[PDB]
Design a protein around this ligand. Sequence first.
Ligand code: NI
Length: 137
Amino acid sequence: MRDMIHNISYCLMVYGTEDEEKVIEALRNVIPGATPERESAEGYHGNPITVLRGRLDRRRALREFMEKFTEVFRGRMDELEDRFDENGNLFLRLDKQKALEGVWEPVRHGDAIHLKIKVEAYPAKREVAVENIRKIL
Ligand code: NI
């Protein structure tokens, strides 16, 4: 058995014209059952937002996520390789509008669902994390 990932931190924003329920529906197409904490902040162009944040470590959610992550990113490792940090983490941003339609679309900038994925890796280093995910993909 492998843990694969230790936990997932997530962040996404709700702008003034957005329906928070649909934003959360989009998040739940990436992490079903996610129940984010709310906090008021400023987003793009200083627009007031609610930030929806969470740190998820529930085994059932992590495993379901890895199942979908694996289907999505099988043979697409070259799209992820540069998104790892020096500490084992994989940073993945997905298009929020696409998520609402049930599609995982990696993006680099813009309005996204931000995931900070703590990859099971020892030593907790970029190369180890990369190798581990590539093997999975
Ligand atoms: Ni601007």
